[PDB]
């Protein structure tokens, strides 16, 4: 099982399918896929947990990676049984996801709190409670209350994608702190990020 606030499960939220891969709502998938490549962690089919998953060493720590393949609003149908099977407490889980309330190129590490309208997080907090960590990857907001679907299922313009990709690359360099349980320092150094 997990140990204290050393992060040992990193989840990335998104939808399956090439048609959603480049959309804002898959920001969490981008981060976990990039982290997997960085550390040479294989993401392999995991039918038992309705996902794609991997396990590997990050900076001397055994860490599991999970991409639910449930569709975003059913993400809990992968995250919850996976974390239960492996006896991973919420305190040791990092969930990376798109954040409408932050600009592209803003990234913040948060512990606790609600789903903030995110339909993936909405499917997870009722089960495991809120005390997991979140890598909130700004995607910016749409022009109103009803363009939300269209915005999260859109592919960002290149300037915004460049800002998100630089923020995501920064965060990758801070995962060493998270897997070592240095959450306060990783929150300091992630939240300080600026694009330019």
Instruction: Tell me how far CA of residue 59 lies from CA of 33, 63, 154, 158, 161, in angstroms.
Output: 17, 10, 35, 33, 28
Domains and CATH numbers, the chain: 1-196 (3.40.50.1470)
- What CA–CA distance (Å, rounded) separates 7 from 179? 5
- What CA–CA distance (Å, rounded) separates 137 from 156? 13
Q: How far apart are the first and last CA of the chain?
A: 40
Nearest to 70 by CA among 142, 115, 119: 119
Backbone angles phi, psi at 183, to 5 degrees: -60, -45
- What CA–CA distance (Å, rounded) separates 13 from 125? 14
As annotated, the binding site for cytidine includes 73, 119
Respond yes or no: is residue 25 known to be catalytic.
yes
Q: How many CB atoms lie within 10 A of CB 25?
A: 23
Which residue among the candidates 3, 25, 61, 115 is catalytic per the annotation? 25
As annotated, the binding site for tRNA includes 20, 71, 73, 119
DSSP state letters, 58-118: ETTEEEEEEEE-S-GGGTHHHHHHHHHHTT--GGGEEEEEEETTS-TT-EEEEES---TT-
Angle at 152 between CA 150 and CA 155, to 5 degrees: 85
Nearest to 101 by CA among 112, 124, 117, 114: 117
As annotated, the binding site includes 20, 71, 73, 119
DSSP state letters, 135-186: EEEE----SSSSSHHHHHTSPPPHHHHHHHHHHHHHHHTTHHHHHTT-HHHH
Q: How many CB atoms lie within 10 A of CB 157?
A: 9
Residue 109: both structure tokens together: 């590490």
- What CA–CA distance (Å, rounded) separates 54 from 45? 9
């Amino acid at each position: 099982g997990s140990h204290m606030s050393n992060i040992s499960l990193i989840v990335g939220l998104g939808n399956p399918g090439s048609e959603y891969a480049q959309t804002r709502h898959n920001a969490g998938f981008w981060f976990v896929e990039q982290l997997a490549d960085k550390y040479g962690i294989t993401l392999k089919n995991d039918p038992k947990f309705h996902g794609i998953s991997g396990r590997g060493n990050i900076e001397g720590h055994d860490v599991r990676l999970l991409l639910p393949m449930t569709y975003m609003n059913r993400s809990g149908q992968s995250v919850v049984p996976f974390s239960k099977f492996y006896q991973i407490a919420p305190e040791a889980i990092l969930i990376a996801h798109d954040e409408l309330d932050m600009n592209p190129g803003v990234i913040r590490l948060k512990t606790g709190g609600g789903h903030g309208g995110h339909n993936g997080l909405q499917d997870i907090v009722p089960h495991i409670g809120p005390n997991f960590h979140r890598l909130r990857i700004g995607i910016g907001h749409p022009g109103s209350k009803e363009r939300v679907s269209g915005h999260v299922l859109g592919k960002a313009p290149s300037n915004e994608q460049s800002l998100m990709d630089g923020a995501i690359d920064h965060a990758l360099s801070k995962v060493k702190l998270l897997v070592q349980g240095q959450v306060p320092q990783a929150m300091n150094q992630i939240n300080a990020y600026k694009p330019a």
